[PDB]
Design a protein around this ligand. Structure first.
Ligand SMILES: *[C@@H]1O[C@H](CO)[C@@H](O[C@@H]2O[C@H](CO)[C@@H](O[C@@H]3O[C@H](CO[C@@H]4O[C@H](CO)[C@@H](O)[C@H](O)[C@@H]4O)[C@@H](O)[C@H](O[C@@H]4O[C@H](CO)[C@@H](O)[C@H](O)[C@@H]4O)[C@@H]3O)[C@H](O)[C@H]2NC(C)=O)[C@H](O)[C@H]1NC(C)=O
Ligand SMILES: *[C@@H]1O[C@H](CO)[C@@H](O[C@@H]2O[C@H](CO)[C@@H](O)[C@H](O)[C@H]2NC(C)=O)[C@H](O)[C@H]1NC(C)=O
Ligand SMILES: CC(C)CCC[C@@H](C)[C@H]1CC[C@H]2[C@@H]3CC=C4C[C@@H](O)CC[C@]4(C)[C@H]3CC[C@]12C
Ligand SMILES: CC(C)CCC[C@@H](C)[C@H]1CC[C@H]2[C@@H]3CC=C4C[C@@H](O)CC[C@]4(C)[C@H]3CC[C@]12C
Ligand SMILES: *[C@@H]1O[C@H](CO)[C@@H](O)[C@H](O)[C@H]1NC(C)=O
Ligand SMILES: *[C@@H]1O[C@H](CO)[C@@H](O)[C@H](O)[C@H]1NC(C)=O
Length: 1781
């Protein structure tokens, strides 16, 4: 079994090598795919980012100055890469090095000191006393002390010394930025054009691009509120106070203008300044000043120089600088809108005013209070308010998350930070604080800070994940090509009956399947190894062992090969299977991507039950590979095992299914599973049949060695069954068959080793040479190398191709040479018993004679068993003819015995009065009669038993005597043929219709034929109507699940919008009662917010009742010992872990347990979430470590990891001045209703609104889109509930905030309407792909009818092919229209207002109609150049899909492009659909906004140009299709057969040309309707033709299910429908059966005898000599008689043939042979047998009387028993004419 496997492997490798066309592409396709993949990979490098923290943002309630400082400088999330000091639980600053803060603190200190200072009083007292004494010295000392204290207080500021330097340095790109960052924080018709171009150059400068967007809605915006309720009025007045807190710079200009002259005259010409300047320079005061100054700068000399009078830095310069600064800050503040408060009556007017202000580019958010009942009391204890703002300034409310998870803290300052720079959080906090202050009436000041949670050193490698999760597509493209190739190969080897021949030679299917598996696995394994190598080298899958991926790809190759072995058992056409394999593989892989989208509810059992396919298992393996690759550790030898096990189970299942289907459902050739002469005993016996039986008798026949015995039968008895049983593959019955002494049922393998079989089909492999065939067959026989070479040389010498030009050439020989080689190949191995099956089927007589010579040369003891339907072959070759019938043996014996036992007498033929010759013959012969009389031919019959006494000689002498009297020109005599013995043993309409009505009749006939072939196709090509239907159905059901992408509902800001989350509360500095009560109110019965309190005022979220436990999670002993080691302080409280080392890219840092440090006490807060106490713990490090470890643990299980925590809280701790200011205002220059009073009040308010007792940091995760506002509302509600007194039941006390964006403007609606292409193009492509399936049926029907089936056969008669094409187009439109209408109704069923509208439906309908009308003729010329059916479907579908994708990409993107792309109807339909949807969307947007537009879609600009374009395109395409086709002596009753005007000629093609879906009578009815037969008598003509050509019992049956004889009879019936004067036939009886060819011959004779000549061409000379009368051999062409029949047999024919048999036997008589040789001089020994001789006499036919005389005289002397004399045949004359060429 090993040499056979080696031979099969060699044959497969040689088949693969000799092509040199598929293997190089099989190698280059995956190479190109992976090169494109690595080229795309090299363009997207991985994005690495270090771990970093974010600063804390200050809200307006935490002070105006810190809020402004946080807004201005740190507004870009610098991600400082280190824990900022603001994240510490104690300090909430990070603005300690600010200069503005120091200046404000120094100003506050100076203001507080100026009240207690009384130096002015002492100076006035000294001035009054001076205007020496005792109290004068004490007064002077007190004045000096006060002056020294004032100087020490003034010189300790040092704030203006830096601000002045900064402002002079302000008046190179990074220098100004650094100066601003140092001065701020740490490290047109409406307004004047001044602020206009100020803002213009601010937007035009690359310095405030991140600051102007945040400062625009602060000083330009405007706030509106509804309704006009006194409670709303109070809360908005509080908001206005909060806003005007920073209005101190407004009333400063008036104060400066009022206090400038006073201070000027006080410093210029006042006595106080004079006394101060006089007391500064002296002899003893210098030491006092030097001591009081403590060595600081600006000594007394500088003091006198600065405070001098009439003057380098004098106080006048500082005065002018202060004046200029006040002037410029007033000019800046002049256009700062601080009156942003507008009350509106109702909501719709508020929205209208909001849109109007948005059109004016000055509009901030608007508050809408719900449930107020205008006219009410202070508050209803539950305030509900919504904040409406522009969609470009707030986060979207349609979704709360990004969808698919990805690393990254989402900290973009502009794209995902609209809640900060948009102004939502600030205004929300202000409104919440105002509501709290109005509800409680308290004076507490609690600040709120926004701290963002840091991220633990993430990297971005999304491309790697996408490539590793979408691997199967690129991994299986080239493999789909390869499996298509191998499927084509398998189906080609199966269809050519090669597997049946291998099984006949003694081979099992197991070894064939194994050889195919190996030959398909070798190149697949090579490709898998190369792909593994290129993946390891190209850094596409690094840190991965090549061995595991190599074995994975090997298992994938094995399972794909077994899938192909399963699929190949369902097809019978090589090209069709090759085209369908890739589609089947694609639709079998599609389940993987279908399941990967809905994997949220996919269980393990469902995955296992769905893992019966190979692509889904490969996808699961690739997902596991990606999961183990994204963490940098890779996959090595250590899920995947389950995937490999499922793939092996799939291989086993595919193998079992293949073994089952091959047995139960085989092809059209397999078997499905649930007158006796004396036997010559002088030779050897090879086969012995004894009582063979079957399923519905007795067979006793013996075959001898040195004889070529025949086996005849009607193919209906037990002849073919017995021949098959003798060859094996069939279980025998209760009988015996001893082949060379071996029983069939006993041993079958020993018999097949020496048994040659030659079936009807020639067995020759393609791409192979004849010497390779000989070698392969000889090696499969079982011979050694020397015997193989000897047999090859002998066969090359015997066949007749001893030349290197034919031995090394492929199967390019003629049919005769191929048949001769196939016959000779059955004699390899020295087989002692051979069984032939119909040799020389359709070869010319020369190749027939050659094969006969080869068979006679291979007769030396080989037991040749002939089996053919030809009688002349079995007569001239069969030595013992055996004819059986009815399953039993009827006759057996030699040719002479069978002809002389039950045959008829000789047949004489005279070729030129018929009564004189008949009377003479009846006078000479006893019982003679006339057989036939045809044109120049008279044939009679004579009894063979008569004329034995010597009457033959006298008759021949009488004929030769008066031969010139009669008109006979030549005479001949022959014997009885074997065909007669085998047969003995077993349309007109009375008038023509050709004319004007003939065209209409042909049109209606073609339409009727097409309707009949389309109606009877319920099982055939009927999917062309239901497949586009379901395609459009699924395309529409896919378009009803996509959101409109233009809706923003009212989203309630609550932290419970997510399923599960973790919270935390950190009580820092637990020594204050306020922080303790705030923590209590935050962790009391009401809970965090308004989730559950006296009910559930939030939809679809009920609260839990009982959950209260302060428990700690267990900890292993390892971490316990690690932390008992010690040295774990606040700084570095846990072992950190590195991330993204060199050459190792890690998505998240992995490190051993103990990263968090300790499990904090967790407790469920009765709100579907748990909180953990983090008091006294490092918040940032703990959060980072817990987040990274939780994400790692959740990703290690592959459970679609999502966010873990969202928010947490950290509580901590941070009038006299006002009183002093009031005293100063009253004490000095007191006034009222002036600018000074207002400025002092504003300054006092600003100084008061900057100190906060306690504060809370709200840690929020920016991954949640609405996480900051939710927890802000929560902490505001907690602050509200903490400020309640006397126990007001804080359960029903809460504040609810909403987020509802305003209505979209015109531009936004236009962009939303235009952004629908991403949905429209998919529907357009799906509709195009569904509608491009109808013309494919028409084009494949045209291809099927084009290959000599119906086109040329109808063109033979007058059919006017233009009318044929017109009828085809009409029927295609009528078929296309019904399906188009059905699709339109299906579309109409659904409610798609974009199409069902009264202005979109008829235009949609006519567009589809025109698309069909234009696409029908486009594919018409594609059927011309296609010499294969059932294959253009997939190619044309791929071309249409490519054109559709090209049009879609062109529409995606221009005028000239759209103008020239109109030639494609798919592009036209796509553009029409796109324009229709766009017009509908624009009209809907205009109706929604309040406009009116009635633009009809039928305008020539939008839609209507494409319609005319497609119409003219279809017209010119039909014209081009019509023009392409055009490319711009035989007397009556003479069968003049060529032995090499349209309506009056009949034609019969060689190959059968019938439709497989029509009946027998319908064919002749259609052909009569085409031949000008009236519709009235067309049925009578059809019935007449049916009765003439037989098959009456099969008149109503599909012609496709007929047999060869039935198809030939149908062709003959069609050939004589109209009754032409001359009918042309080509091979009428080919491969038929006796008793059936005689019927066609008699029909032809009856046709020709009625005065209608026939012209028949064929290869069998027996049919020609039995039918034709004049062998018109047109060597020179045209018409030329070649001397009839008998004339040609007597003129150029050979001599006679005499077969003689001796009376004596055992074994023969040499004297008879000697006398026969001595009698005739030209006697040749044609065949010498035992008791049987035959001889040939050339050039001695004219003396036949003398030959008969000598035979009669020698019968008694030579002891002759039987004799026979016959003439030459027609095939002998043919080979004689062809041998001399
Ligand atoms: C919670 O836990 C985290 C870590 O788990 C703690 O964060 C640690 O403490 C500091 C955070 O404020 C970090 O100190 C910084 O370290 C930087 C690293 O630079 C190098 O440091 C190494 C020593 O590790 C030196 O040999 C090198 O020469 C480098 O200096 C320092 O650069 C940084 O110094 C600052 O530089 C800036 C700019 O020059 C100055 O303006 C500034 O004044 C300061 O000098 C600073 O020393 C520390 O690295 C960080 N991580 C670790 C592992 O310690 C938190 O502190 C914990 N929470 C609490 C409340 O303690
Ligand atoms: C809300 O505050 C604004 C300014 O903070 C107030 O507008 C001031 O008063 C009148 C307009 O009512 C103007 O003459 C002033 O110039 C405005 N600005 C300043 C700085 O005084 C407004 O009156 C306040 N409204 C309510 C209802 O309190
Ligand atoms: C608003 C009014 C009341 C402020 C009055 C205080 C002003 C006039 C005084 C107090 C402190 C003084 C400053 C003290 C220090 C210096 C640094 C020196 O190199 C230039 C002069 C300069 C800058 C002085 C300018 C004048 C000064 C700013
Ligand atoms: C006789 C042999 C040598 C030639 C056979 C032609 C083969 C190689 C060509 C002709 C038609 C081609 C197919 C046409 C359609 C498709 C569908 C597409 O989705 C995958 C490629 C696939 C499956 C092509 C594979 C290669 C193909 C089958
Ligand atoms: C900043 O912190 C320092 C301590 O390092 C402190 O002295 C200073 O007052 C702080 N600045 C503030 C709170 O503005
Ligand atoms: C805003 O949109 C809502 C949503 O339907 C609609 O009811 C309202 O009339 C619209 N208002 C304006 C001014 O367009």
């Amino acid at each position: 079994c090993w040499p056979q496997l080696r031979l099969l492997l060699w044959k497969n490798l040689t088949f693969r090598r000799r092509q040199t066309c598929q293997l190089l592409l099989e190698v280059a396709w995956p190479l190109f795919i992976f090169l494109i993949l690595i080229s795309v990979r090299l363009s997207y490098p991985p994005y690495e980012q270090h771990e970093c923290h974010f600063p804390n943002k200050a809200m307006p309630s935490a002070g105006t100055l810190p809020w402004v400082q946080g807004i201005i400088c740190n507004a870009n999330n610098p991600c400082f890469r280190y824990p900022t000091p603001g994240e510490a639980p104690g300090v909430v600053g990070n603005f300690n090095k600010s200069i503005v803060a120091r200046l404000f603190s120094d100003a506050r200190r100076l203001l507080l000191y100026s009240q207690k200072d009384t130096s002015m009083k002492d100076m006035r007292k000294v001035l009054r006393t001076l205007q020496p004494s005792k109290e004068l010295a004490e007064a002077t000392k007190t004045l000096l002390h006060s002056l020294g204290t004032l100087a020490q207080e003034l010189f300790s500021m040092r704030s203006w010394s830096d601000m002045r330097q900064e402002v002079m340095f302000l008046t190179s790109s990074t220098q100004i930025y650094q100066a601003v960052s140092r001065i701020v924080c740490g490290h047109d018709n409406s307004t004047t054009p001044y602020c206009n171009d100020l803002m213009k150059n601010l937007e035009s400068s690359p310095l405030s691009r991140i600051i102007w967007k945040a400062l625009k809605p602060l000083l330009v915006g405007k706030i509106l509120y509804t309704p006009d309720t006194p409670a709303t009025r109070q809360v908005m007045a509080e908001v206005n106070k909060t806003f005007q807190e920073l209005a101190v710079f407004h009333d400063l200009e008036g104060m400066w203008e009022e206090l400038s002259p006073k201070i000027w005259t006080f410093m210029e010409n006042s006595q106080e300044m004079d006394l101060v300047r006089m007391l500064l320079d002296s002899r003893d005061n210098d030491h006092f000043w030097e001591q009081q100054l403590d060595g600081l700068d600006w000594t007394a000399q500088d003091i006198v120089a600065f405070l001098a009078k009439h003057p380098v830095y004098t106080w006048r310069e500082a005065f002018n600088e202060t004046n200029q600064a006040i002037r410029t800050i007033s000019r800046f503040m002049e256009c700062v809108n601080l009156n942003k408060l507008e009350p509106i009556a109702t909501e719709v007017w508020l929205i209208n005013k909001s849109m109007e202000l948005l059109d004016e580019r000055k509009f901030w958010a608007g508050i809408v209070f719900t449930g107020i009942t205008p006219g009410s009391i202070e508050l209803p204890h539950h305030v509900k308010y919504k904040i409406r703002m522009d969609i470009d300034n707030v986060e979207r409310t349609n979704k709360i998350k990004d969808g698919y998870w990805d690393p990254g803290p989402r900290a973009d300052p502009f794209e995902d930070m609209r809640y900060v720079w948009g102004g939502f959080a600030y205004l929300q906090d202000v409104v919440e604080q105002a509501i709290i202050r109005v509800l409680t009436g308290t004076e507490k000041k609690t600040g709120v800070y926004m701290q963002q949670m840091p991220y633990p050193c993430y990297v971005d490698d999304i491309f790697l994940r996408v490539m590793s999760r979408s691997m199967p597509l690129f991994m299986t493209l080239a493999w789909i090509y390869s499996v298509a190739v191998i499927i084509k190969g398998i189906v080609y080897e199966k269809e050519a009956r090669l597997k049946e021949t291998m099984r006949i030679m003694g081979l099992d299917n197991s070894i064939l399947w194994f050889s195919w598996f190996i030959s398909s696995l070798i190149p697949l394994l090579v490709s898998a190894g190369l792909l593994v190598v290129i993946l390891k080298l190209g850094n596409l899958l690094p840190y991965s062992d090549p061995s595991v991926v190599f074995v994975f790809l090997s298992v994938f190759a094995v399972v794909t090969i077994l899938q192909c072995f399963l699929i190949s058992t369902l097809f019978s056409r090589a090209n069709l299977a090759a085209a369908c394999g890739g589609i089947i593989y694609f639709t079998l892989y599609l389940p993987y991507v279908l399941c990967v989208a809905w994997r949220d509810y996919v269980g393990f059992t469902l995955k296992i039950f769905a893992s019966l396919l190979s692509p889904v298992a490969f996808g699961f393996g690739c997902e596991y590979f990606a999961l183990f690759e994204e963490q940098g550790i890779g996959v090595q030898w250590d899920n995947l095992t389950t995937s490999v096990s499922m793939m092996l189970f799939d291989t086993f299942l595919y193998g079992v299914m293949t073994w089952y289907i091959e047995a139960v459902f085989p092809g059209q050739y397999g078997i499905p599973r649930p007158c006796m002469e004396e036997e010559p005993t002088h030779l050897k016996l090879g086969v012995s049949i004894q009582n063979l039986v079957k399923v519905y008798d007795g067979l006793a026949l013996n075959f001898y060695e040195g004889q070529i015995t025949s086996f005849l039968g009607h193919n209906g008895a037990g002849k073919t069954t017995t021949m098959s049983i003798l060859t094996g593959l069939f279980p025998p019955t209760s009988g015996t068959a001893y082949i060379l002494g071996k029983d069939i049922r006993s041993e079958m393998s020993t018999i097949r080793q020496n048994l040659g079989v030659c079936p009807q089909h020639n067995v020759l492999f393609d791409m192979l040479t004849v010497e390779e065939h000989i070698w392969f067959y000889a090696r499969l026989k079982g011979l050694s190398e020397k015997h193989v070479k000897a047999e090859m040389e002998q066969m090359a010498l015997d066949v007749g191709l001893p030349s290197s030009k034919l031995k090394s050439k492929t199967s390019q020989l003629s049919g005769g040479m191929q048949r001769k080689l196939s016959v000779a190949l059955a004699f390899v191995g020295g087989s002692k018993v051979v069984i032939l099956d119909e040799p020389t089927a359709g070869v010319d007589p020369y190749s027939r004679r050659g094969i006969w010579e080869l068979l006679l040369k291979y007769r030396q003891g080989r037991t040749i068993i002939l089996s053919t339907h030809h009688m002349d072959e079995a007569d001239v070759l069969g030595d013992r003819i055996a004819i059986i019938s009815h399953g039993k043996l009827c006759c057996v014996g030699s040719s002479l015995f069978l002809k002389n036992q039950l045959g008829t007498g000789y047949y004489l033929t005279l070729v030129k009065d018929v009564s004189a010759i008949s009377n003479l013959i009846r006078k000479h012969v006893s019982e003679a009669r006339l057989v036939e009389d045809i044109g120049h031919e008279l044939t009679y019959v004579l009894p063979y038993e008569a004329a034995k006494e010597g009457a033959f000689v006298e008759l021949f002498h009488e004929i030769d005597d008066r031969l010139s009297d009669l008109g006979i020109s030549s005479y001949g005599i022959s014997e009885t043929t074997l065909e007669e013995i085998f047969l003995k043993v077993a349309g007109k309409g009375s008038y023509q219709v050709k004319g004007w009505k003939l065209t209409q009749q042909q049109f209606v006939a073609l339409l009727w034929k097409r309707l009949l072939i389309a109606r009877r196709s319920r099982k055939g090509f009927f999917a062309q109507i239901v497949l586009p239907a379901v395609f459009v159905c699924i395309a529409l059901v896919f378009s009803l699940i996509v959101p409109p992408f233009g809706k923003y509902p009212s989203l309630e800001l609550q932290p419970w919008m997510y399923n599960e989350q973790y919270t935390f509360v950190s009580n820092d500095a637990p020594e204050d009662t306020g922080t303790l009560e705030l923590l209590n109110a935050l962790t009391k019965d009401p809970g965090f917010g308004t989730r559950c309190m006296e009910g559930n005022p939030i939809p679809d979220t009920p609260c839990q009742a009982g959950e209260e436990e302060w428990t700690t999670a267990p900890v292993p002993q390892t971490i316990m010992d690690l932390f008992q080691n010690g040295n774990w302080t606040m700084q570095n409280p846990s072992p950190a872990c590195q991330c993204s080392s060199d050459k190792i890219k890690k998505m998240l840092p992995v490190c051993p347990p103990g990263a968090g440090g300790l499990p904090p006490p967790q407790r469920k807060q009765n709100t579907a979430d748990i909180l953990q106490d983090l008091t006294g713990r490092n918040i940032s490090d703990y959060l980072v470590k817990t987040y990274v470890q939780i994400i790692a643990k959740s990703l290690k299980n592959k459970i679609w990891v999502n966010e873990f925590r969202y928010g947490g809280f950290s509580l901590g701790v941070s009038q006299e001045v006002n009183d002093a200011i009031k005293q100063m205002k009253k004490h000095l220059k007191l006034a009222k209703d002036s600018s000074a009073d207002r400025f002092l009040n504003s300054l006092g308010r600003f100084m008061t609104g900057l100190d906060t007792k306690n504060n809370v940091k709200v840690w929020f995760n920016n991954k949640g889109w609405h996480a900051i506002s939710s927890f802000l509302n929560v902490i505001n509600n907690a602050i509200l509930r903490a400020n309640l007194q006397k126990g007001e039941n804080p359960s029903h006390y809460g504040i609810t905030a909403f987020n509802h964006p305003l209505n979209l403007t015109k531009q936004q609606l236009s962009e939303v309407a235009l952004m629908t292409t991403s949905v429209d193009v998919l529907v357009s492509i799906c509709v195009i792909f569904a509608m491009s399936f109808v013309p494919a049926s028409f084009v494949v029907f045209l291809i099927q009818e084009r290959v000599s089936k119906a086109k040329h056969l109808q063109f033979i008669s007058g059919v006017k092919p233009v009318i044929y094409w017109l009828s085809n187009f009409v029927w295609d439109m009528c078929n296309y229209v019904v399906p188009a209408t059905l699709v339109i109704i299906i579309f109409i069923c659904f409610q798609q207002k974009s199409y069902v509208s009264s202005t979109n439906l008829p235009v949609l309908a006519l567009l589809l109609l025109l698309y069909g009308w234009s696409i029908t003729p486009l594919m018409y010329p594609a059927s011309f150049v296609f010499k294969i059916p059932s294959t253009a479907y997939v190619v044309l579908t791929s071309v249409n899909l490519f054109i559709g994708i090209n049009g879609s990409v062109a529409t995606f993107v221009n005028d000239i492009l759209k103008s020239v792309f109109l030639i494609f109807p798919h592009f036209c339909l796509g553009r029409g659909l796109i324009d229709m949807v766009k017009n509908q969307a624009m009209a809907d947007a205009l109706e929604r906004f309040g406009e009116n537009r009635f633009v009809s879609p039928l305008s020539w600009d939008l839609v209507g140009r494409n319609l005319f374009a497609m119409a003219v395109e279809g017209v010119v395409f039909f014209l081009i299709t019509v023009l392409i086709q055009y490319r711009f002596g035989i007397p009556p009753g003479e069968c003049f057969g060529l032995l090499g005007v349209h309506q009056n000629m009949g034609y019969c093609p060689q190959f059968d040309a019938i439709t497989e879906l029509l009946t027998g009578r319908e064919h002749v009815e259609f052909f009569a309707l085409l031949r000008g037969v009236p519709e009235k008598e067309v049925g009578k003509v059809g019935e007449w033709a049916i009765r003439k050509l037989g098959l009456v019992k099969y008149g109503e049956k599909y012609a496709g299910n007929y047999s060869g004889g039935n198809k030939r009879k149908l062709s003959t019936a069609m050939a004589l429908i109209g009754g032409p004067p001359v009918v042309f036939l080509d091979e009428p009886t080919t491969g038929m059966d006796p008793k059936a060819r005689r019927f066609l011959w008699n029909c032809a004779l009856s046709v020709v005898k009625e005065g209608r000549s026939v012209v028949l061409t064929s290869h069998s000379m027996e049919e020609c000599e039995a039918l034709c009368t004049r062998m018109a051999i047109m060597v020179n062409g045209r018409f030329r008689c070649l001397g009839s029949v008998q004339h040609l047999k007597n003129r150029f024919g050979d001599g006679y043939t005499i077969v003689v048999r001796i009376a004596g036997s055992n074994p023969d008589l040499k004297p008879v042979q000697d006398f026969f040789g001595l009698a005739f001089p030209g006697s040749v020994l044609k065949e010498k047998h035992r008791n049987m001789l035959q001889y040939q006499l050339p050039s001695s036919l004219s003396s036949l009387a003398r030959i008969f005389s000598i035979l009669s005289q020698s019968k008694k002397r030579l002891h002759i028993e039987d004799y026979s004399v016959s003439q030459t045949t027609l095939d002998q004359v043919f080979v004689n004419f062809a041998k001399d060429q």
